[PDB]
Ligand binder design. Structure first.
Ligand SMILES: CN1C[C@@H](c2ccc(S(=O)(=O)N3CCCCC3)cc2)CC1=O
Length: 126
């Protein structure tokens, strides 16, 4: 079976609004979400529907952009680095589970190159 998705809200986790987190939602996530390669990454890997029975035997820290989007919308993150770490987990999982040269890996690599450009332009904390 699929595991439960990663937590996207938590009543005990403190909250704040920052210009860097707003940039991650309004610029970084927005750009990646609408990219033509985004769709396999817009929700948790459904190993049942995709017929990937070993996926969660190999990947123990799943992550996807649907989860990241909810975390940003729900004010789950305290700082930008927590969000950046989640994007990197998503990319790394893809590179670990799949083989170099697979189309899904090429898609992830393209999304990551775009992501790193946008993070290079992260605004300073106000
Ligand atoms: C992040 N993920 C998602 C999982 C997934 C696998 C295959 C398909 S696919 O067969 O639809 N297709 C493959 C070729 C490139 C476009 C998508 C979708 C999702 C695997 C993975 O590491």
């Amino acid at each position: 079976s699929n595991p439960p998705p990663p937590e996207t809200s938590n009543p005990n986790k403190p909250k704040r609004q920052t210009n860097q987190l707003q940039y991650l939602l309004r610029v970084v996530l927005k750009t990646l979400w609408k990219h033509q390669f985004a769709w396999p990454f817009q929700q948790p890997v459904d190993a049942v529907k995709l017929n990937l029975p070993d996926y969660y035997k190999i990947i123990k820290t799943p992550m996807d952009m649907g989860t990241i989007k909810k975390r940003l919308e729900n004010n789950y993150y305290w700082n930008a680095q927590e969000c950046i770490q989640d994007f990197n987990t998503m990319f790394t999982n893809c590179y670990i589970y799949n083989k170099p040269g697979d189309d899904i890996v090429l898609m992830a690599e393209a999304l990551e190159k775009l992501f790193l450009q946008k993070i290079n332009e992260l605004p300073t904390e106000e």
